[model samples]
Target: YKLICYYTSWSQYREGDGSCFPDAIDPFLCTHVIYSFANISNNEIDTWEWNDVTLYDTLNTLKNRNPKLKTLLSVGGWNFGPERFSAIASKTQSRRTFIKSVPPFLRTHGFDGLDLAWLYPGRRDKRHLTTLVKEMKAEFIREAQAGTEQLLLSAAVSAGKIAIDRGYDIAQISRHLDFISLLTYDFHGAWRQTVGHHSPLFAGNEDASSRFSNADYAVSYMLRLGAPANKLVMGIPTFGRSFTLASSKTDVGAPVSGPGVPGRFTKEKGILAYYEICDFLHGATTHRFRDQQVPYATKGNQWVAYDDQESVKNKARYLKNRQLAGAMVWALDLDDFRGTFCGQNLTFPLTSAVKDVLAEV
Candidate 1:
């Protein structure tokens, strides 16, 4: 099982002089750490700025503590979008250019391999996307054969069937990947006018208005579509999705008045880390709705659907029963990285709960 976690480059740019340094990360808590995001220019992949450069060395040094730790360079994020990827991946030569550049770049930076955070592949580029991955995996195998590392190749993909069908050739793509991390959360969020759990274990019995959004359906559907069940790692969020309810009496599909207020610590509108949510949850009314089997809280007109230790344990158990690889967190630093961010909290309560429960399995 791979306990993969992402470490965002921007986390070091947060307020208060960016205290969540790479040195602050406890590598033992995770088996793999992906540094996001090394960007894609015309052909080569590059670290964004000086900040990514400075952290690159320390991020690899994490191996000193846990020699088993593997680090990968994440190229392309939602911010970078998909233009360059489509351009590079569409043509055979362009694909070769990017593939050739990966080994040297990863070797120079001391990374184990690459994780393509392509945001998506989309309908038109679906075939090209498979080609790019197949070629890249071919290169990974060649390098391993040459007596270097058994390079890791993985990708972050959408859980939605449309994206899966349009952007990926499930069996073909899964063959090249060491593992696939499903962006299972964000199935619903403040992006819409409806209030729904961002990540629900079950879809419950609501559909006409609910979009059949939930993890259970997505996971099972993907496997049936030919994705490798064992190599699938369910991605979990350490944060909450917040919304301002149009009506004070809120249920699942309540109308939303845009995003909720920004979190004090995370400070992102419609999003808050569990630590920040913890502070608000202190005075909020928490409830468990449906057999969706997750919790949400209401405070005034603000409603947030998020995972706590209990919900995490439930998700973890579900993942274990599904016999998936392991849980992969969106970003590690979002949790109380210092162990004291939450007023009355222990370190990484959500992630620790996942680790503990999985340990039992």
Candidate 2:
């Protein structure tokens, strides 16, 4: 099945007056909704507080509207404290407590399943990550075998080797998951202090020393390390990173200054959401770089490297050739609502583009 993972941020959804939830969502193109970054702090579960009621109401409404949509809660994120997870995962009692609490919590909130977003399973002396996953999978099996409601168990994993090495024992961990999503974006960013390909098949001109680009290296790394291709899901960013060009050059190797561009909609630096870029693209001319397989446009001293229909189609081909499960967009909010990006007045949204491509496989 082709699964579309849309991250629903309770706080962000509340922003702009909640027009981005069920109203903006096209359920025809998506199957799963991940309520992301529910935090565990000071031994308390910090659920979505800002717009919790509305979020759930909207989710329930969406579920009623479309029975196919499976909404799951995702806990932990990039900023989660290692100590918190260590405390929770290190002890079997705590782990069991967590497992037991999940079903009731889901039933209480009307959620379908859970997606673990633990950044690294064993970093900072937390070696129990694999153990936690194994146990959690056992819990799922037991609960499912007992005829309890079906709970979808999936994970958001890092695309890099450091994460794979420290966070999971693939051979042991993959068996427990319904699917593993490889975060293939953010491979290139302003952190490099230069213009480089955000996602590329080979190292772009700015990243000549690096070996891999695109999902080939990432998926291959996992498969070579013992992950089943059918269980691997590729992640695509619905945004792009920007850089402050020192000159008129818009190439990947162009000299740049400052900390680079950050996400236009969020606090992160060096990245801009597709919608923000769409606004930026209004007055600019876009040009494609054949070698890098990405497009960029230079207006004044700003340069942005992002994806488009052509680029996304190409990446989808890569995913298909690799025989992976499917693809996931980082978010649904980043897409142009009217399909303006596709040169159509009303076509499928960006999420549909990903689904359509994955459907081919």
Candidate 3:
């Protein structure tokens, strides 16, 4: 439950290569490295080579390099997610097939376990959501009882309400999962067509009328619902979302009244990742925020909102105060190691700080 860093693309970290892995990171501080392999359906999963070899070989190499590190395979992500859950989770046979396929898959690919990143389980349908989680946990128990490799079972859950109500049977699901990762970021962004906090401790004043809870509220609610504190992992985003500035400036702190600005890199407007905003901050984009710790930045007639170390520390403190499980960052790549953006390095500053505080517990 210490710090967990995520790595992708094995080939980038081959011997004598410096683009990925240990060269790109300090492994000593990280206890787990969750690697993304898309899905078995994707041919790319078969073709990708690492260290001039196959991904399995690369995993072996990584294991050799860091014996203490535990690697987990993430099944689905934001882009290609949950769409197949209904089909996959609807029938017991399909669920059994997936559970049966997992052991060999982990052994073949060199992973310690699986992390189900099913964007959502309950959001699509309430009744189905409850049934799916129950069945998934049942499969895990059955597998464990049958003497399977004793694999780790973790899930990435949504922070939204629908997910809260129907996605899981907290007490039941907690018994099956090694830990549950709650994606606590992305509460606000350009997607809302307004300027607001990217990850607020409490709902912003503008959003008081909205029913959704902020990061702190979400964690508290989960604990109240019977999830063990140690079995819950709070998620933090490595990026920030941006918005366009208006001439009147009245909309500075206001949630976007209409459509928000487009993303810089994703090219599909409305949201920009943290790395993109970091680049903008390097070019003298200054940020401002409300006393509530909500953030905003102004540049060339556009204003953007995002999270920084200050907000990260505040949220992390909340996690410590609650004595909930450890923290999981969305990514490691978006950090400003060169110190060009936001005037400081991000990864270690945020993560290391969290660990230091957790040490007190």
Candidate 4:
């Protein structure tokens, strides 16, 4: 089983304990550590952050400690948008241009693979997405014949049925890609006016429009579309989706005024790192729904739905039960990597839960 951990490059900019660098990563904890992200410049692969080259050096050096570990460089993120991605993938010249630059960049940076995170490819962009990966995989194979190890190719994909139907040729891309990282979180957030778990294992009382918003439905949907179980990496979040409750009633579907206050570290208005959620839970009332298999904590008007160690284990067992590839944590930085928060004296409590349970034969 692969435990793929994502290391966000911008996490280095957070203040104090919230800040994380590539050196802080525990090399042995995950089978693969994917660095996010490198950007597109002049229709070719390039570093997004100014110090990414240096960070890449620091990150790949972790393999010195654990030679079995793999490091992947991801390009494109939510902020990178769909336009640039469509621009590059829609044309053969730009697509090849991007493909030609990849192996050299990965080799230079010591990355074992490349992960494409195009966010959401539009309806017309679906076949283009598959073509890009297909050609890229072919290129990787041809280059590997020249004697270097074959570089892994994967895509960070949308988990919703709507997005999945519109954005992916699942079986086709699955044929060319090594694995698919399902972005199973962010199912709900401050973008809406109601409280809901961001990454529920099972749906609960959600309206018809939001029925397929849970992780279970997403996994099954992909599988039904012919994605192989062993190549499907189910994503789990290390953070929570928070909101400001409008009424005193703090239930799953309670009315929310707006997003809860920003985290001290993550600094996102509607989100909280697991460590920050730990602090919030200290003074809050928490509830774990028997049906949903995840928990929510409420402190006065603040309400947040997030995963803890128990929920992480629940999701892990689910992943194993389904005979899936492995668990992929959306990020390592959002977790309590410092081992100070959450009072468990454990760094990566959520991620550790996944690793621990999945170890069971």
Per-model tally of clashing residue pairs: 0, 7, 10, 0
The residue pairs in collision within model 4 are none
The best candidate in terms of lDDT: 4
Q: Taking the tens digit of each residue's C-alpha lDDT, what string does model 1 give over 1-361?
A: 6688998887776776234778878878888999988887668777786777679999999898899999998898878869778989988887898898888889888999899888878889889989989999998888787788778899999887677778888888888899999988868882798888888888777554455467887889778878877889998898889999998768867899989899765677999877677778878899886678889999999999998778878888898998998989977888777767666557677777788887894
- Would you list the C-alpha lDDT of every candidate in the order shown? 0.84, 0.70, 0.62, 0.90
TM-score of each: 0.95, 0.88, 0.80, 0.98
Question: Alpha carbon lDDT of residue 143, candidate 4?
Answer: 88
Candidate 3 per-residue lDDT, tens place, 9-100, comes to 53244233112443445556467767665463421122233332254455545667778877787776665556576666666666556656
For 1-361, candidate 2 gives per-residue lDDT tens digits of 5565665564353334222554556656677877776766444445755776567667666777789888877888867776678788887777777877676676678878778887666654335777777777776667777576778788888787666776677887788888888888757662666676677644445445666555567788999989998988888777777778877777656778854455444545666667667677878878877766778776777777888767887877788888888787777766665455435665345566677777763
Q: What would the per-residue lDDT of candidate 4 be over residues 1-361, giving only the tens digit for each residue? A: 9999999999999999898998888888999999998999998899998999999999999999999999999999978988999999999999999999999989988999999999889999999998999999999999899798999998899998888998899989999899999999968882888878889899866455688989999999999999999999999999998888899988656888899999988898998999899988888898987777899988878888899999999999999999999989988999889989989688788888899998999
Instruction: Give candidate 4 regions above 4 Å deviation.
Output: 205-209
Ranking by TM-score: 4, 1, 2, 3
Q: lDDT for model 1, on a 0 to 1 scale?
A: 0.84
Model 1, runs deviating above 4 Å: 206-211, 343-345
